[PDB]
Protein backbone atom coordinates (compact mmCIF):
# COMPACT_ATOMS: atom_id res chain seq x y z
CA UNK A 1 0.00 0.00 0.00
CA UNK A 2 2.92 2.43 0.36
CA UNK A 3 2.50 5.41 2.68
CA UNK A 4 -1.28 5.56 2.26
CA UNK A 5 -2.18 3.13 5.05
CA UNK A 6 -0.62 5.53 7.56
CA UNK A 7 -2.96 8.32 6.44
CA UNK A 8 -6.28 6.52 5.87
CA UNK A 9 -7.68 3.43 4.17
CA UNK A 10 -4.99 1.26 2.62
CA UNK A 11 -4.90 1.40 -1.18
CA UNK A 12 -3.38 -1.37 -3.28
CA UNK A 13 -0.47 -0.33 -5.52
CA UNK A 14 2.23 -2.21 -7.47
CA UNK A 15 5.58 -2.19 -5.71
CA UNK A 16 7.52 -1.14 -8.86
CA UNK A 17 5.03 1.72 -9.10
CA UNK A 18 5.52 2.57 -5.42
CA UNK A 19 9.31 2.75 -5.84
CA UNK A 20 8.89 4.97 -8.91
CA UNK A 21 7.09 7.53 -6.73
CA UNK A 22 9.69 7.16 -4.00
CA UNK A 23 12.40 8.00 -6.51
CA UNK A 24 10.18 10.95 -7.43
CA UNK A 25 10.42 12.03 -3.78
CA UNK A 26 14.21 12.44 -3.76
CA UNK A 27 14.91 14.22 -7.05
CA UNK A 28 15.16 11.55 -9.76
CA UNK A 29 12.45 11.10 -12.37
CA UNK A 30 10.42 7.89 -12.48
CA UNK A 31 12.01 6.81 -15.78
CA UNK A 32 15.20 5.91 -13.90
CA UNK A 33 13.62 3.00 -12.02
CA UNK A 34 11.83 1.28 -14.91
CA UNK A 35 14.92 1.50 -17.12
CA UNK A 36 16.90 -0.27 -14.36
CA UNK A 37 14.22 -2.27 -12.54
CA UNK A 38 16.01 -5.62 -12.81
CA UNK A 39 19.36 -4.13 -11.77
CA UNK A 40 17.84 -2.28 -8.81
CA UNK A 41 16.03 -5.40 -7.58
CA UNK A 42 19.33 -7.29 -7.76
CA UNK A 43 20.96 -4.46 -5.80
CA UNK A 44 18.19 -4.52 -3.19
CA UNK A 45 18.19 -8.32 -2.96
CA UNK A 46 21.98 -8.40 -2.57
CA UNK A 47 22.04 -5.50 -0.10
CA UNK A 48 19.38 -7.01 2.16
CA UNK A 49 21.25 -10.33 2.15
Amino acid sequence: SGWTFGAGPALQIPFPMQMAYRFNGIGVTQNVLYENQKLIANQFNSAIG
Binding site: P14, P16, Y34, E35, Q37
Partner: peptide, 23 residues
Protein backbone atom coordinates in the same frame (compact mmCIF):
# COMPACT_ATOMS: atom_id res chain seq x y z
CA UNK B 1 12.53 -1.72 -22.11
CA UNK B 2 9.78 -0.86 -19.62
CA UNK B 3 8.19 -3.86 -17.92
CA UNK B 4 4.40 -3.66 -17.84
CA UNK B 5 3.98 -0.98 -20.53
CA UNK B 6 0.69 -1.19 -22.42
CA UNK B 7 -0.37 0.01 -25.87
CA UNK B 8 -2.39 3.20 -26.30
CA UNK B 9 -2.40 6.53 -28.15
CA UNK B 10 -1.81 10.08 -26.93
CA UNK B 11 -3.93 12.91 -28.34
CA UNK B 12 -1.59 15.57 -29.69
CA UNK B 13 -3.32 18.95 -29.08
CA UNK B 14 -1.33 20.72 -31.84
CA UNK B 15 -1.62 18.79 -35.11
CA UNK B 16 -5.46 18.92 -35.40
CA UNK B 17 -5.27 22.63 -34.55
CA UNK B 18 -2.31 23.21 -36.88
CA UNK B 19 -3.84 21.35 -39.84
CA UNK B 20 -7.45 22.58 -39.60
CA UNK B 21 -6.50 26.22 -40.23
CA UNK B 22 -4.24 25.56 -43.23
CA UNK B 23 -6.38 22.83 -44.82
Amino acid sequence: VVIGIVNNTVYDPLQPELDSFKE
